[PDB]
């Protein structure tokens, strides 16, 4: 049947880090670059 969960193919990428989506990685990767080094704003936990 499905033999693979593939939607339309608009935003196959996602920044789990925050929970966003992107059309292509090239764009996401960069968006994740800023994410790096997540400092504890409130609750000190990883
Ligand atoms: Zn993100």
């Amino acid at each position: 049947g499905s033999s693979g969960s593939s939607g339309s193919g608009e935003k196959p990428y996602g920044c789990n880090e925050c929970g966003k989506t992107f059309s292509q990685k090239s764009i996401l990767s960069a968006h994740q670059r800023t994410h790096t080094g997540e400092k504890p704003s409130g609750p000190s936990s990883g």
Side-chain angles (χ1 to χ4, degrees), residues 14-22 28 31-32 34-35:
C15 189
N16 170 28
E17 287 314 328
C18 57
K20 282 195 160 73
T21 57
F22 301 79
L28 159 70
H31 165 97
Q32 280 192 3
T34 190
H35 270 303

Side-chain angles (χ1 to χ4, degrees), residues 28-46:
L28 159 70
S29 166
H31 165 97
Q32 280 192 3
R33 290 271 72 203
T34 190
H35 270 303
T36 62
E38 208 298 326
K39 286 196 278 277
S41 58
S44 208
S45 55

